[PDB]
């Protein structure tokens, strides 16, 4: 019965990690940020409404130019929008309409999408022909594609419902690295600003820190009570925020290896579909099932604002790299740019 | 707006048009979510109608059906079952020759999957076309193996008719919220050749009753 002895050692190691986290827990982030001036009530207003999706929008991603954004809808369309002019730049017909993630390449030359087809499809936005075409179909995940994020034009990291994340060489189409260790469906990804490591939240109510080059889970963060649907790094890359089904957002520090705040209101019971940070990181914008985005003071756990204006579940949201705008997509087939 | 801005707006309007015709074309398709236990006979159901998820397309009496098979999605279903929220109907396949089998009992697994899908929060009004497959093999096994193995409280004849009716009732009583949805149970084995007709009848019935409910007549 060597299983018991190994399980005993694993339990002892878990206790050691818990004690190490508790020893560093000298002062919660709330205690330190009592003296900081609380930004009372930000009033973000819908600047644009992106209409043209005919089903539930499941994912959006901003371009690095902070003007172009891709959106994924179950109508089988990957639409690229000019958010300034509201114009649609591209409407990409998806081979599988069951898309639930979309990424935009940091170069802007590619978008990725995927979902229940278990394929991460890479689309060449900039062809000699005037059409967007599938440049690559990344097969190898055995569950649905829940998130994808480009490292560059040739590296993309994908999370899946097969409980694993994968690093793909797009030119070869092969899984360069597989990130195993999650026991539940991995729902969200967030690349660190340096893209040398990323966090993934899964349905085992845990967020894991993965080194892209090493392929190892450097840290595991367990503070949520239900499935983690959303994850987002802090702008400096030393912390990340999660969004779970327990109506709670949490901020986990990488270096402290511990959770720093819980962003939960007793009047909120719906799960979080998407989290994102403003450019400075002081605001944590979270999309919810109660149809609206809540803006949180990331440093004080204060509900600084509400982005109400969607008639269905806010499935996705991202802040532009310049931080000028937040676009929230929702199940009511509408994308709204706020500011 | 500059000349290039005007031409970009024109391109966006052409994209809007194409999205409009694509949505109009997609609205004329009856969406079906196909469920079951994989070994339940949904494969021969697909064959009669004709990795990731499989979309099977067929037309019957001028209705075009899009039937989505999600059996290959071995991941947690709560995270993607809402994708099929607006589905016209659910086609649930259950092998009748699974009462005496085990993976727990196969028919108990089918029963709990059916209960979860039927009473799912996303399918409160979506009717279920319940296919009870392997009726001939169910005959050949009910002749020898009693149904009391799966249902200890059966207390009934071990003949095909009574046993099959009992299984159908056991599946249909898992249907809570019986006001908002209906179960269209069909008995097939592998050569019924009326399964597409049954699905057409069930879907047209669902459409007609939805239209009646709109008008306050159901």
């Amino acid at each position, epitope marked *: 019965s060597e299983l018991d002895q190994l399980r005993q050692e694993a339990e002892q190691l878990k206790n050691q990690i818990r004690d190490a986290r508790k020893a560093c827990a000298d002062a919660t982030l709330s205690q330190i940020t009592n003296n900081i001036d609380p930004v009372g009530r930000i009033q973000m207003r819908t600047r644009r409404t992106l209409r043209g999706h005919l089903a539930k929008i499941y994912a959006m991603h901003w371009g690095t130019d902070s003007r*172009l954004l891709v959106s994924a809808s179950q109508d089988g369309k990957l639409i690229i929008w000019d958010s300034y002019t509201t114009n649609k730049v591209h409407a990409i017909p998806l081979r599988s309409s069951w898309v639930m993630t979309c990424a935009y390449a940091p170069s802007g030359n590619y978008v990725a999408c995927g979902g229940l087809d278990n394929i991460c499809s890479i689309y060449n936005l900039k062809t000699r*022909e005037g*059409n967007v075409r599938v440049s690559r179909e990344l097969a190898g995940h055995t569950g649905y594609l829940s998130c994808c994020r480009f490292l560059d034009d040739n590296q993309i990291v994908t999370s899946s419902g097969d409980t694993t994340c994968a690093l793909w060489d797009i030119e070869t189409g092969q899984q360069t690295t597989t990130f195993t260790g999650h026991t539940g469906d991995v729902m969200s990804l967030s690349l660190a600003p340096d893209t040398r490591l990323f966090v993934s939240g899964a349905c085992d109510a845990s967020a894991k820190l993965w080194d892209v080059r090493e392929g190892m889970c450097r840290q595991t963060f367990t503070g949520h009570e239900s499935d983690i649907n959303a994850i987002c790094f802090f702008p400096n890359g030393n912390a990340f925020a999660t969004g779970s089904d327990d109506a709670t957002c949490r901020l986990f520090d990488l270096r402290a290896d511990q959770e720093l705040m819980t962003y939960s209101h007793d009047n909120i019971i719906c799960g979080i579909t998407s989290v994102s940070f403003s450019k400075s990181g002081r605001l944590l914008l979270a999309g919810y099932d109660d149809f609206n985005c809540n803006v949180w003071d990331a440093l004080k756990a204060d509900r600084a604002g509400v982005l109400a204006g969607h008639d269905n579940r806010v499935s996705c949201l991202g802040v532009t790299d310049d931080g000028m705008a937040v676009a929230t997509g929702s199940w009511d087939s509408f994308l709204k740019i706020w500011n | 707006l500059s000349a290039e801005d005007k031409a970009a707006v024109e391109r966006s309007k052409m994209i809007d048009r194409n999205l409009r015709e694509d949505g109009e074309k997609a609205a004329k398709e009856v969406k079906l979510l196909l469920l079951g236990a994989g070994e339940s006979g949904k494969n021969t159901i697909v064959k009669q109608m004709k990795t990731g998820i499989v979309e099977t397309h067929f037309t019957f009496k001028d209705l075009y059906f899009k039937m989505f098979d999600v059996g290959a999605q071995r991941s947690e279903r709560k995270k993607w079952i809402h994708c099929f929220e607006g589905v016209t109907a659910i086609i649930f396949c259950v092998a009748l020759s699974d009462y005496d089998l085990v993976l727990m009992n196969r028919m108990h697994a089918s029963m709990k999957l059916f209960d979860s899908i039927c009473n799912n929060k996303w399918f409160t009004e979506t009717s279920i076309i319940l296919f009870l497959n392997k009726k001939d093999l169910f005959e050949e096994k009910i002749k020898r193996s009693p149904l009391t193995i799966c249902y200890p409280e059966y207390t009934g004849s071990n003949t095909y008719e009574e046993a099959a009716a009992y299984i159908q009732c056991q599946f249909e009583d898992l249907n809570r919220r019986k006001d908002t949805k209906e179960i269209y149970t069909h008995f097939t084995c592998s050569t019924d050749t009326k399964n597409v007709q049954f699905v057409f009848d069930a879907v047209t019935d669902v459409i007609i009753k939805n239209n009646l409910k709109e008008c306050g007549l159901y």
Partner: single-chain antibody
Amino acid sequence: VQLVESGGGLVQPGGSRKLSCSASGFAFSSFGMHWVRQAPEKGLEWVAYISSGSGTIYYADTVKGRFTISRDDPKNTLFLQMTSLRSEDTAMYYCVRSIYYYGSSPFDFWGQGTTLTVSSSDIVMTQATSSVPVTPGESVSISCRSSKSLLHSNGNTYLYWFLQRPGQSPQLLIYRMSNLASGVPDRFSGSGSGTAFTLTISRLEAEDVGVYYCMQHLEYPLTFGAGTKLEL
């Protein structure tokens, strides 16, 4: 990607011709197509524009009413119906594909062209300098003057640079001023502001020899500069 022009030839004045553009290798229906003509010894002159989906059409004031532009999207063909051909229509007619979305590269590909030898408020691009003498490996700057500020209130400056290499169709170098076109070496650079622009070549070669044309894309009389030739 190729555009092949059909038609042209000797025409008695007052006649009628149809120019045909057999487009292949690209999504023709999504590109707004242009006709840009060039007289046998003079510079480029934009003739007609038909947008993607045919919903928007423009003609040069020298051909409006007199010319008709049309496209056959199923057949991937662009047409220029010409009636009452004056001697001023004696030019090589180029079909130019141009696509318009955010960040697109209009005028990126040009057809080979067919010569048409007819028998016997517009913004003014000015290239006063012409036929510069250059030595390979040495930098050169080509100036461009505009009669109006090409910089739109949206932030874009709609100046285009083309290279008419000897015996070859024009080739887009820089599309929206300081925007290098795909396939162009990163030694051409675009610069300027408002009405004055420069196209600088970092270290030219023998392949850089040709005529360099401006173009405004701010309104739709599309006007070119009297191209500045380069010669060794």
